[PDB]
Amino acid sequence: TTIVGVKFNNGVVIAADTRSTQGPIVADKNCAKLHRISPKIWCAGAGTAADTEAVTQLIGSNIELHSLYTSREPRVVSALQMLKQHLFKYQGHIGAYLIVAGVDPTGSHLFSIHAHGSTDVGYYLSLGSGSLAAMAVLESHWKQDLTKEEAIKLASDAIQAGIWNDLGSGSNVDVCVMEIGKDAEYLRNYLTPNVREEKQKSYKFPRGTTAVLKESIVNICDIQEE
């Protein structure tokens, strides 16, 4: 579980990986951690799974209601603010770690919010558990004034090296590149790490191997007709 966001002066790339964990057991092999607050504001989530997903729902609703009454397109800063207040009244008992990335009538953006109500700025942020490993990569090959073609390599390779230096990371790299003046581009499965090794034996069994102690038939599909 790592998140990079790479702001450049053309757009923004925000990428994260599809391995979710519940302790040492891998809970899910593909799950989309890139949420759409709005169409033009995608975020990703790291941290507690049941708390990221549910609070992208709350604000997703609240930002659409809001935009409809304003009759103007969302601000990014609107998303960030809604989150900030909400987190803070529980006093950090909702452990949301979001990187809120978004284009708007003010330009390209990248913000962070941490699980206490703290918010940070930057043209490069890294967040989550596998952060440390992605962060190391970034500072060596970054510069300001990237294109979408530069940025997309750098982010996705930091996510690929995060797999190979973290145990929560793994599986497919999804990337979303949201340019200014365009529809957001969900280039899912931009990088495949590895294809699962071919096993050397078929394990599909003979029929009638198991026993049946009793059985019965119920069809709940219909209630008894005329």
Partner: peptide
């Protein structure tokens, strides 16, 4: 699909 606001889904 052009008023979708996103692509790639």
């Amino acid at each position: 699909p052009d008023l979708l606001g996103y692509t790639g889904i």
